[PDB]
Ligand binder design. Sequence first.
Ligand SMILES: *[C@@H]1O[C@H](CO)[C@@H](O[C@@H]2O[C@H](CO)[C@@H](O[C@@H]3O[C@H](CO[C@H]4O[C@H](CO[C@H]5O[C@H](CO)[C@@H](O)[C@H](O)[C@@H]5O[C@H]5O[C@H](CO)[C@@H](O)[C@H](O)[C@@H]5O)[C@@H](O)[C@H](O[C@H]5O[C@H](CO)[C@@H](O)[C@H](O)[C@@H]5O[C@H]5O[C@H](CO)[C@@H](O)[C@H](O)[C@@H]5O)[C@@H]4O)[C@@H](O)[C@H](O[C@H]4O[C@H](CO)[C@@H](O)[C@H](O)[C@@H]4O)[C@@H]3O)[C@H](O)[C@H]2NC(C)=O)[C@H](O)[C@H]1NC(C)=O
Ligand SMILES: *[C@@H]1O[C@H](CO)[C@@H](O[C@@H]2O[C@H](CO)[C@@H](O[C@@H]3O[C@H](CO[C@H]4O[C@H](CO[C@H]5O[C@H](CO)[C@@H](O)[C@H](O)[C@@H]5O[C@H]5O[C@H](CO)[C@@H](O)[C@H](O)[C@@H]5O)[C@@H](O)[C@H](O[C@H]5O[C@H](CO)[C@@H](O)[C@H](O)[C@@H]5O)[C@@H]4O)[C@@H](O)[C@H](O[C@H]4O[C@H](CO)[C@@H](O)[C@H](O)[C@@H]4O)[C@@H]3O)[C@H](O)[C@H]2NC(C)=O)[C@H](O)[C@H]1NC(C)=O
Ligand SMILES: *[C@@H]1O[C@H](CO)[C@@H](O[C@@H]2O[C@H](CO)[C@@H](O)[C@H](O)[C@H]2NC(C)=O)[C@H](O)[C@H]1NC(C)=O
Ligand SMILES: *[C@@H]1O[C@H](CO)[C@@H](O[C@@H]2O[C@H](CO)[C@@H](O)[C@H](O)[C@H]2NC(C)=O)[C@H](O)[C@H]1NC(C)=O
Ligand code: NAG
Lengths: 601, 601, 139, 139
Amino acid sequence: QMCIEKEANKTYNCENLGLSEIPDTLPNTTEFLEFSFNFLPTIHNRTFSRLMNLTFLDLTRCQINWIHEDTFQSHHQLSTLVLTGNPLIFMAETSLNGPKSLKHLFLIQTGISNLEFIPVHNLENLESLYLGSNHISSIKFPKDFPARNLKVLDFQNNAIHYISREDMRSLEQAINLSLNFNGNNVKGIELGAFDSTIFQSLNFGGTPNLSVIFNGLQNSTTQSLWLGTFEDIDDEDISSAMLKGLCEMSVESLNLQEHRFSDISSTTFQCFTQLQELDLTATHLKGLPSGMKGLNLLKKLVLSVNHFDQLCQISAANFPSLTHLYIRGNVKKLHLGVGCLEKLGNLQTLDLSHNDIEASDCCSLQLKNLSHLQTLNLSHNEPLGLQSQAFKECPQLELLDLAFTRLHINAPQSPFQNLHFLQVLNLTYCFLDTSNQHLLAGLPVLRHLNLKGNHFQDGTITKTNLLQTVGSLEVLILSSCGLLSIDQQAFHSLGKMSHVDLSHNSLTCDSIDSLSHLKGIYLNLAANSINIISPRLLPILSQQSTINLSHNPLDCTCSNIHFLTWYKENLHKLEGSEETTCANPPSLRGVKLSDVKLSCG
Amino acid sequence: QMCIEKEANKTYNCENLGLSEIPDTLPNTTEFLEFSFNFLPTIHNRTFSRLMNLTFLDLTRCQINWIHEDTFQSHHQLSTLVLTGNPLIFMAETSLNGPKSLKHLFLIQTGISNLEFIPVHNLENLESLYLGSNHISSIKFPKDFPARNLKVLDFQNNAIHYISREDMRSLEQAINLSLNFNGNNVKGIELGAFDSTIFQSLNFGGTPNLSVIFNGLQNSTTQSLWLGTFEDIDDEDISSAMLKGLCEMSVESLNLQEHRFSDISSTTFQCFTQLQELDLTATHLKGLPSGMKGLNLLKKLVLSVNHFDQLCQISAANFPSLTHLYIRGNVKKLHLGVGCLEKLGNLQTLDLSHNDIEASDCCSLQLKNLSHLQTLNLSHNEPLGLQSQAFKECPQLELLDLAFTRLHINAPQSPFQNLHFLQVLNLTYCFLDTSNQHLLAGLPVLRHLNLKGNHFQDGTITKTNLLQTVGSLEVLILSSCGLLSIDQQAFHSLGKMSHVDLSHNSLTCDSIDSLSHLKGIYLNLAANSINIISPRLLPILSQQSTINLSHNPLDCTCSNIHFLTWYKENLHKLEGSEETTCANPPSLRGVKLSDVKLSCG
Amino acid sequence: AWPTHVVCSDSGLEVLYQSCDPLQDFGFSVEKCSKQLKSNINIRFGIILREDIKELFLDLALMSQGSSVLNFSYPICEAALPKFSFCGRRKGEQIYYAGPVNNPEFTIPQGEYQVLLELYTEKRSTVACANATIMCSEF
Amino acid sequence: AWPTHVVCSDSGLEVLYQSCDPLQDFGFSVEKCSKQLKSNINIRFGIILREDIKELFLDLALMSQGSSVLNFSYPICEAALPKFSFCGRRKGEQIYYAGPVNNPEFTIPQGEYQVLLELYTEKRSTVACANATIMCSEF
Ligand SMILES: *[C@@H]1O[C@H](CO)[C@@H](O[C@@H]2O[C@H](CO)[C@@H](O[C@@H]3O[C@H](CO[C@H]4O[C@H](CO[C@H]5O[C@H](CO)[C@@H](O)[C@H](O)[C@@H]5O[C@H]5O[C@H](CO)[C@@H](O)[C@H](O)[C@@H]5O)[C@@H](O)[C@H](O[C@H]5O[C@H](CO)[C@@H](O)[C@H](O)[C@@H]5O[C@H]5O[C@H](CO)[C@@H](O)[C@H](O)[C@@H]5O)[C@@H]4O)[C@@H](O)[C@H](O[C@H]4O[C@H](CO)[C@@H](O)[C@H](O)[C@@H]4O)[C@@H]3O)[C@H](O)[C@H]2NC(C)=O)[C@H](O)[C@H]1NC(C)=O
Ligand SMILES: *[C@@H]1O[C@H](CO)[C@@H](O[C@@H]2O[C@H](CO)[C@@H](O[C@@H]3O[C@H](CO[C@H]4O[C@H](CO[C@H]5O[C@H](CO)[C@@H](O)[C@H](O)[C@@H]5O[C@H]5O[C@H](CO)[C@@H](O)[C@H](O)[C@@H]5O)[C@@H](O)[C@H](O[C@H]5O[C@H](CO)[C@@H](O)[C@H](O)[C@@H]5O)[C@@H]4O)[C@@H](O)[C@H](O[C@H]4O[C@H](CO)[C@@H](O)[C@H](O)[C@@H]4O)[C@@H]3O)[C@H](O)[C@H]2NC(C)=O)[C@H](O)[C@H]1NC(C)=O
Ligand SMILES: *[C@@H]1O[C@H](CO)[C@@H](O[C@@H]2O[C@H](CO)[C@@H](O)[C@H](O)[C@H]2NC(C)=O)[C@H](O)[C@H]1NC(C)=O
Ligand SMILES: *[C@@H]1O[C@H](CO)[C@@H](O[C@@H]2O[C@H](CO)[C@@H](O)[C@H](O)[C@H]2NC(C)=O)[C@H](O)[C@H]1NC(C)=O
Ligand SMILES: *[C@@H]1O[C@H](CO)[C@@H](O)[C@H](O)[C@H]1NC(C)=O
């Protein structure tokens, strides 16, 4: 006693309550129920019987031993059953009969040693079967077990060593199946076990021998193949001889994380011709050789967490077709070099975040010939010296992420000038000089600007300010800027705004004046210094669609009466309503504003 | 509250009580404690603090999640810790520290997936480690795991599919180890992993491929090698090719139960040349080929549960050195034939029980030339006709078991005559004609005779009876014989008896007369018709060491006072005191004779 | 005692059971279901062992109309002959078994039947106790 | 409050920890105790998960004297990068890890040290919470 309410008659959380039964206080129409970590040694035809409309049941770690006959007979609308971590001894044959369409079943770590344990004749609508962390060494299902609707089959952390034809035949009815063999020890596969079967994902994470997997996957079709290892698993180095089997395969995307290559050469990736995506995260790469075969048509490449010194060491000439390039969190300090990516004509998305990149003059020589680029991530790097027209070589850029990277920009230069297609600009904690009135010039179509963490002169935004050049702005973030006041005219050239975030400053009610010319916006005034909101500012608030006023030292006296009656009337417009509490009188400190009912005359 | 005493201040049983702690009533001197099926989620250094003298602790299925630091610090005497069926999350590094000689550890089905889970610091004196029914697929122990004193390593019902050199290297500390891989699915062994190794027992029960096992065990030495399969495991027929590796192994005892032979010929057993024992139970054998090379020096052979019609079909010529032969529970009706075992000159034990053997004239033609035979088992067969000197061909016989096999003997013949070495004769439910006074003649050294279930005429033993000829007798069982009276001089010529069983009959106190010359005997008179015991009979009972009188309709009135006082005086001599009861008075029937107290003088 | 479980209840054939072991319940389930009991039938079994099953024996008593029809004892596990893969498993272990029983094909006619099954060790300690009811009619 | 567990007490240095998660305790051990630790040291970790660890982050705060030396956040499990084999295991699962952590070969001076460790998911839900103390002395 008692359960946490999350939706009217709909969603309830009873986690960790140590209950032996379903509380008779819970309403009949409960659909989503979180009942994990309670105490139900046996569940039967009476335990849940009164909650007939259940759709989601989480029974995790309830110490269930027995699921008896016709337990879920009444529950025709049950879609998801979670039985993870229950010491299940036996399930009755009709224990899962009842639900018209049971879609998701979680039987993780339930001690299952034989696949015959699962009651078969109501698994026809099953979309997900999770059988991880059990005593399963064979994936051979019993006959009569349906797999036509099955899309996710998870065997993570079991003891499957061998996969045969007959093992796989019990899954021939399935198409676009995701099989997860992560954390197993597959040392043998019957040759052509995965024949003509069409898979969505195959995961062989931590698999001892890559050769076995490749050879065994001959003549198979899958979209995604995850063959990464881990920091805690010892692996043998990947030779090109191991990767031969890829030519006899239909693969779209391939992951080889945490692996180490044995003498990387020009023919190493010769079997990769059919591949669209290749993820080589943390593969101990010092570089890639030039003239590399089989990567000419690759579209997406992840080279994150490697050991490059300069961008030119990735030998980009190997990847003329590339549209997406991710190099995130290089282990060493990364230097951009001069025109290292110039041969990547088709590139649309470049992620160079978390690399400790440092450039005193940026970024014309660095991003040379990147004329198709639309997304650029340069956040979480060391300081960058931006010239005027710093992004001349990327005219087609739509999103620029520079968050947490200090920018050295000289007054009155405009580094972002001639980015006529830029829509999103993230400059959180860039330590900008906001007094530069030309800083955001040359962005005629900018609609989302993030200036979080930046300082303003006197902690105020005056009539003449940065934002006057951005007349097309829709989303504006000015949180954590240490703002004390905003001029009532400071947003007057910003007629199109629908999202204004002014949280975590020191603003008072006078700030609302700067929004009188706007309607239907999302207004975030959280974590400020608002106490009294004068009735003259209430119509301005009424114009807006959604308002957050939480974590404000709000006044709950008669001096603030007009707003308090407004508050209760416009509760549909209010975000973070339960975090909106009084500061004064001391008598109401901590009390939600929705509970407050005052009287005057 | 409340525990069961098995030995005073020493052995206690607390099973199935639902205790959360050790009760205050358990004496400090407890050495053996069975505490299974209680509730101990977390055990710590105080849990067993008030029972320092424990040598045996059973904590099976107490729902133990945590074993904390120094739990058994104050338990120098602990020899056996049983932790089976507890969902162990973590075991502290010093949790088993304390015991000066912890010899036996049971961690069966505790959710273990990594052998690093077991604390190593106090396992130097371990002789038995039981690790069955876990999530174990690699037997590689940590570098700092002691195995020098380890004699039994049990891995039953795990997921070991592969055994590497690196796995077996961590066990090289052990000398003469018994490894149990029963219920594992060993698909491969690194060639040379068992090189130069010496083991007591290797059990690969239920293994998929025998060739894999023989192949991997090349150049290894074992006493016992258990390679049988089971009824619920699908059979791969054993060819001559599968048994090749045995030629390159040192094996002393082989078990191939439940396996099938195909194509079965005189070359199947070519590598068997140095087996001392071979067990072929339930191997669907219709016979064994003659002129066979490779079983020349075999000592013991089990051919039980097979499909022989004739004894001659086993081709006894193959086994000249054979000393033990077991053919038990033949699936078909078995026929002895004529001189089928004549080439087994050195044979010492012959077991032919449960075969439906039918012989109208026995046993000279059947047991021809078995002159070295010492133990013969012909129990649980169809009826046998025996004339005088029926076992002439086995003069050196010491034990003859004929239990539950009806015997056809004509008076006044003596079938057991000339058996000068016969010591034990089991004749239970043989439906003998007990009026034949010569039945047991020619047995100078018989000391154990079982006549259970046989009928005596009128249900009475006369002064002159069959037992007179066997004056050297020590043990006699005449239970369930439907006896009504024994003549007082029926056992006169049996002055060496120390064990008399007369239970489950209809004898009165007058039968005790026949035991007067006997002293220091075990006397069982349970379930009879004994009412009043005359005061003359108590000196007879006082001469004996132990006496049972349970399930008798004894008189508990003034007429049987002398016996009732004798009873309460001699509780050190009484077997089943708590099970002995009155008959009259009607309301006081059911009360133990130790509790019954009368008033006479 | 313990609640009554349904093994079968389709047109006619109707098999119920109850555990007569006061300590615990167990789970039992058959593959198919018909009047014609086919030989070597497949069963499903779930139980916590209260004893080591190194040596295990079964007692079966078939009854109808208040009189015994069939008695037998038969060994399931022995040291000399472990018949099944689960043999030799220990006290406190959870067992699950799904496989054949190697039964001779029975012909059970119309009538009301009571079956008593006992699984016991060499000490005659109860591993399992079944109190079963079979109601059979026309097909 | 959960009990304080001893990680080390090898005549010189003492490492203690305590769970700050009100819901549950957890188990933690090291392979060896010394003032001078090698790179990639081996730990042992046992816990029931209260949340899916598809995405898991660690927060560390090391305190010496009273001057906060070192705050850092580090991802242990991520959608794009699962560093360890146990990544992606789900709510209610019992985890046991015995293997390396990524640590530089480093030595610690004498004195008293206070450490806070939090493991959390994407929603900032607590997986684990530890309050630890390190006491180092003469050698
Ligand atoms: C010569 O060869 C002989 C036969 O091969 C050997 O005889 C054996 O002797 C040993 C040791 O003395 C004895 O071991 C004891 O076993 C006790 C449990 O007994 C169970 O099994 C028996 C045998 O069943 C077989 O036979 C019957 C009758 O023919 C048949 O119906 C069965 O189906 C079965 O046959 C099948 O199996 C065999 C072997 O696999 C095949 O060869 C054969 O083809 C068949 O396939 C049963 O009779 C018992 O059942 C009775 O007893 C239990 C109680 O124990 C009752 O619950 C049950 O209802 C039934 O009761 C009936 O009989 C009793 C009287 O006996 C009546 O009161 C009652 O009304 C009923 O009528 C069991 O299922 C075991 O408990 C015992 O343990 C004790 O001693 C050990 C140490 O020895 C201690 O640890 C313990 O503390 C105990 O004190 C003991 O181990 C065998 O039973 C017996 N074997 C056989 C096969 O008969 C003989 O030893 C050998 N001699 C020599 C010198 O070598
Ligand atoms: C351009 O690239 C950048 C950087 O690569 C992208 O930045 C990402 O942005 C998204 C969205 O803004 C963030 O997602 C959110 O994450 C939180 C969990 O945050 C945790 O990680 C934070 C980042 O840690 C890295 O960076 C810091 C800072 O320097 C560093 O100290 C860390 O050590 C770590 O860096 C290491 O790891 C990197 C990647 O593996 C390596 O590259 C690198 O080299 C290092 O090895 C971290 O700051 C944070 O800790 C703080 O916050 C928590 C409170 O949450 C607090 O407890 C701590 O004390 C810290 O104050 C965390 O550890 C997650 O909670 C969010 O989830 C919500 O939202 C999603 C939807 O987005 C919902 O689905 C959820 O339900 C939930 O409501 C969210 O996912 C992301 O963290 C950030 N990534 C990084 C690496 O910075 C950026 O998106 C890219 N731009 C574009 C346009 O694509
Ligand atoms: C900078 O701001 C942008 C825009 O708000 C953030 O971009 C989001 O990034 C995540 C990918 O991690 C996506 O799920 C969202 O779709 C992006 N939003 C938009 C509008 O594109 C970005 O995360 C911010 N950068 C940092 C470092 O916080
Ligand atoms: C018939 O009686 C004999 C002797 O009482 C039994 O032989 C014993 O069998 C056990 C094992 O079964 C041996 O280990 C003992 O050494 C034997 N006892 C003696 C005294 O020799 C025999 O088991 C009995 N037969 C039956 C069918 O019960
Ligand atoms: C730049 O890319 C274009 C294709 O987009 C290509 O024609 C041109 O040769 C490239 N220039 C250099 C210097 O690589």
